[PDB]
Design an enzyme around this catalytic site. Structure first.
Site, mmCIF file in Angstrom:
data_model
loop_
_atom_site.group_PDB
_atom_site.id
_atom_site.type_symbol
_atom_site.label_atom_id
_atom_site.label_comp_id
_atom_site.label_asym_id
_atom_site.label_seq_id
_atom_site.Cartn_x
_atom_site.Cartn_y
_atom_site.Cartn_z
ATOM 1 N N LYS A 47 -3.538 6.767 23.342
ATOM 2 C CA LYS A 47 -2.729 7.114 22.166
ATOM 3 C C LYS A 47 -3.401 8.080 21.139
ATOM 4 O O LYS A 47 -2.735 8.933 20.633
ATOM 5 C CB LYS A 47 -2.236 5.860 21.406
ATOM 6 C CG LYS A 47 -0.928 6.125 20.670
ATOM 7 C CD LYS A 47 -0.810 5.369 19.372
ATOM 8 C CE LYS A 47 0.583 5.606 18.794
ATOM 9 N NZ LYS A 47 0.701 4.904 17.489
ATOM 10 N N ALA A 90 4.320 1.761 4.623
ATOM 11 C CA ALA A 90 5.528 1.988 5.422
ATOM 12 C C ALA A 90 5.541 1.004 6.561
ATOM 13 O O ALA A 90 6.498 0.298 6.803
ATOM 14 C CB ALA A 90 5.553 3.414 5.980
ATOM 15 N N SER A 136 3.529 12.343 12.111
ATOM 16 C CA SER A 136 3.293 11.640 10.825
ATOM 17 C C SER A 136 2.247 12.288 9.906
ATOM 18 O O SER A 136 2.247 12.059 8.692
ATOM 19 C CB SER A 136 2.936 10.167 11.086
ATOM 20 O OG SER A 136 1.564 10.008 11.344
HETATM 21 N N1 LIG Z 1 4.392 5.300 9.463
HETATM 22 C C1 LIG Z 1 4.407 5.299 10.798
HETATM 23 O O1 LIG Z 1 5.534 5.492 11.316
HETATM 24 C C2 LIG Z 1 3.195 4.887 11.635
HETATM 25 C C3 LIG Z 1 3.421 4.697 13.024
HETATM 26 C C4 LIG Z 1 2.429 4.276 13.881
HETATM 27 C C5 LIG Z 1 1.236 3.941 13.302
HETATM 28 N N2 LIG Z 1 1.047 4.142 11.990
HETATM 29 C C6 LIG Z 1 -0.335 3.848 11.572
HETATM 30 O O2 LIG Z 1 -0.424 2.685 10.716
HETATM 31 C C7 LIG Z 1 -1.309 2.914 9.653
HETATM 32 C C8 LIG Z 1 -0.446 2.613 8.527
HETATM 33 O O3 LIG Z 1 0.381 3.759 8.399
HETATM 34 P P1 LIG Z 1 1.476 3.995 7.183
HETATM 35 O O4 LIG Z 1 2.797 4.504 7.646
HETATM 36 O O5 LIG Z 1 1.922 2.702 6.500
HETATM 37 O O6 LIG Z 1 0.740 4.462 5.856
HETATM 38 P P2 LIG Z 1 1.650 4.529 4.416
HETATM 39 O O7 LIG Z 1 0.765 5.585 3.714
HETATM 40 O O8 LIG Z 1 3.176 4.804 4.530
HETATM 41 O O9 LIG Z 1 1.384 3.163 3.625
HETATM 42 C C9 LIG Z 1 -0.001 2.704 3.685
HETATM 43 C C10 LIG Z 1 -0.636 2.567 2.311
HETATM 44 O O10 LIG Z 1 -0.643 3.825 1.588
HETATM 45 C C11 LIG Z 1 -0.088 3.584 0.332
HETATM 46 N N3 LIG Z 1 0.657 4.683 -0.244
HETATM 47 C C12 LIG Z 1 1.702 5.262 0.330
HETATM 48 N N4 LIG Z 1 2.293 6.141 -0.514
HETATM 49 C C13 LIG Z 1 1.595 6.100 -1.672
HETATM 50 C C14 LIG Z 1 1.671 6.785 -2.977
HETATM 51 N N5 LIG Z 1 2.604 7.695 -3.148
HETATM 52 N N6 LIG Z 1 0.807 6.519 -3.950
HETATM 53 C C15 LIG Z 1 -0.152 5.621 -3.680
HETATM 54 N N7 LIG Z 1 -0.266 4.922 -2.526
HETATM 55 C C16 LIG Z 1 0.550 5.121 -1.487
HETATM 56 C C17 LIG Z 1 0.912 2.434 0.586
HETATM 57 O O11 LIG Z 1 1.187 1.601 -0.533
HETATM 58 C C18 LIG Z 1 0.104 1.562 1.445
HETATM 59 O O12 LIG Z 1 -0.831 0.987 0.527
HETATM 60 C C19 LIG Z 1 -1.729 4.410 9.729
HETATM 61 O O13 LIG Z 1 -3.074 4.511 10.201
HETATM 62 C C20 LIG Z 1 -0.817 5.044 10.750
HETATM 63 O O14 LIG Z 1 -1.498 5.878 11.588
HETATM 64 C C21 LIG Z 1 1.982 4.599 11.114
#
Ligand SMILES: NC(=O)c1ccc[n+]([C@@H]2O[C@H](COP(=O)([O-])OP(=O)(O)OC[C@H]3O[C@@H](n4cnc5c(N)ncnc54)[C@H](O)[C@@H]3O)[C@@H](O)[C@H]2O)c1
Ligand SMILES: NC(=O)c1ccc[n+]([C@@H]2O[C@H](COP(=O)([O-])OP(=O)(O)OC[C@H]3O[C@@H](n4cnc5c(N)ncnc54)[C@H](O)[C@@H]3O)[C@@H](O)[C@H]2O)c1
Lengths: 299, 299
Positions: free
Chosen positions: B176, B10, B249
């Site tokens: 944070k 994401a 989240s």
């Molecule tokens: N999303 C937010 O709004 C947000 C905000 C601030 C910080 N963060 C931080 O950044 C880091 C990244 O967060 P995030 O939002 O991308 O994680 P995300 O899970 O949305 O994406 C990260 C990974 O997980 C995989 N993934 C997601 N859904 C999947 C599925 N259904 N099947 C298999 N794999 C899947 C994605 O391909 C990617 O490889 C985290 O540690 C989070 O704390 C996220």
């Protein structure tokens, strides 16, 4: 025996009924108008069965306290009439420390505290589900009343409540409160039954932590819990053969019926004492704080 | 700049896309086959409503790599891309202590850790919702690399990620992580959004407790949190005007999408360090245990 049951809720009704079925004169006393009216009219219905027990609003030889821990004071207040000189009082409530209030109202010689492993569900006004097997433990707080305690255990066992005298009782109340201070909060908060809880990977750590907090406080009260046994006793509930598939009574109270829990008289009592004895009890504190927060989130 | 984003989930996608849009050469690296295939074929679709065909490679196969995996994929991702590591690494992940793994794989001179306040939702394979505003903070680990950090902040701000150099950074990460170590677990476990949580009567006590456990550990790392501020910063989320009505989240990860949380890299990290430094952290221990138990109760 002429017997009042003060608090003919779920569990009060279990006892009321088994005592009337073996042929005692049972008078129920309750604070819930609809329950009362319903039972005056149609009797007490149960899925163990019907029985027209006498029942009176709150506003005999033996009175048996079975309120929730939080109604208990007002119930005493409202029935002080029946607390005569002869008249024996039995607490089988699930928390810790009820003796203190009971003392305000009834002579020491006449008070008997204890525990039960019986279960019961109140489906609605006048209606109960009566689960499985059970037992009772009880002891006298009064000087040299060990013999009348054994008769009370005996009178009760004759109605099938399968009750026993105990010479520890405070061991037994703490040991059971541990079971009530783990299964209950945990199931309530996590939305799982007991079997599902013991399947999780951190249940054991959480249970053990909590049991230790209970045991450090009890120790101050010169009560030395066999912590591995108590833990194996709490963990026993994980078994789907036995009670595993049931939700504990605190889950029922709050998640199912949108009523407050006894958490202040269990994990909360441990915290109150932790403060007083200078013993850290954070898991009880947090678990308590969590359940209240959960209450607030629903009402 | 040539830029890999290792973990184009994401958030990785948010950054990948804004860095391509301003004209950087962006290569996404991901471990999720369907997401990949979907983006090879149709590009990356986003509701910012806009499209971009970004090069994207499975992680079995640049100047700047930007780590944006979940903290639990992070190690395997390093392992799988050691090839690409003069080579420049940025972490903006949400937990604490990612430096330690990143160090195993990349020279100290080249590592930059940080935070972001940007948000992003992954709706499905190849699809993202990109919500509202944001910012970045970052600093260098690496002796005397303060100047390249300011360029990195600058290069990123030129794509609209609005990033800033920081001379504390470890203050900022801890500060944070407190917000992440409270709103997350508590919302997740209680099934409430933030506004509902702050309405409850024990939310403040639970938050304060936790923040303190975070601040005692940080202190051992010579990092001195302004606890009242951090608390008011965590409590700020209670506001229905601002983010109150959103679920955090972690709730979204587990309750909504049935995926594991980062709890071991937030509250869990605090516990791992409590053990090290001999500081009691029971509320983080228990909150961690509760979330894992919850995970297990759903799979
Ligand atoms: N999303 C937010 O709004 C947000 C905000 C601030 C910080 N963060 C931080 O950044 C880091 C990244 O967060 P995030 O939002 O991308 O994680 P995300 O899970 O949305 O994406 C990260 C990974 O997980 C995989 N993934 C997601 N859904 C999947 C599925 N259904 N099947 C298999 N794999 C899947 C994605 O391909 C990617 O490889 C985290 O540690 C989070 O704390 C996220
Ligand atoms: N039910 C169990 O299996 C169980 C097991 C062991 C011990 N206990 C102990 O027994 C004591 C009573 O348990 P319980 O099952 O009877 O609780 P319960 O609420 O069924 O009833 C306790 C009392 O609650 C009152 N009550 C119930 N619903 C009410 C309502 N809607 N409005 C006003 N009053 C209402 C009842 O009428 C009764 O006064 C507790 O301390 C409990 O922990 C219960």
């Amino acid at each position: 025996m002429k017997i009042a049951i003060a608090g003919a809720g779920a569990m009060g009704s279990r006892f009321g009924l088994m005592l009337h079925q073996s042929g005692n004169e049972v008078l129920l006393i309750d604070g819930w108008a609809e329950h009362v009216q319903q039972i005056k009219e149609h009797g007490l219905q149960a899925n163990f069965v019907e029985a027209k027990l006498p029942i009176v609003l709150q506003s005999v030889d033996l009175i048996i306290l079975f309120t929730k821990a939080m109604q208990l004071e007002k119930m005493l207040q409202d029935i002080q009439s029946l607390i005569k000189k002869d008249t024996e009082v039995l607490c089988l409530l699930n928390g810790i420390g009820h003796e203190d209030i009971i003392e305000k109202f009834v002579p020491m010689e006449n008070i008997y505290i204890g525990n039960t492993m019986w279960t019961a569900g109140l489906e609605g006004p006048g209606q109960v589900k009566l689960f499985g097997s059970g037992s009772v433990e009880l002891q006298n707080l009064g000087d040299g009343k060990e013999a009348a305690a054994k008769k009370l255990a005996d009178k009760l066992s004759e109605s099938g409540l399968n009750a026993h005298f105990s010479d520890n009782i405070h061991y037994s109340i703490y040991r059971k409160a541990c079971v009530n201070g783990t299964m209950n909060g945990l199931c309530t908060i996590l939305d799982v039954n007991m079997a599902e809880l013991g399947k999780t990977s951190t249940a054991h750590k959480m249970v053990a932590t909590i049991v230790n907090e209970f045991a450090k406080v009890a120790a101050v009260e010169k009560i030395e819990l066999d912590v591995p046994e108590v833990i194996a006793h709490c963990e026993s509930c994980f078994d789907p053969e036995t009670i595993g598939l049931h939700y504990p009574s605190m889950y029922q109270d709050l998640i199912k019926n949108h009523r407050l829990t006894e958490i202040d008289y269990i994990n909360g009592a441990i915290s109150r004492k932790g403060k007083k004895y200078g013993v850290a009890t954070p898991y009880c504190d947090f678990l308590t704080e969590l359940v209240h927060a959960k209450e607030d989130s629903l009402n």
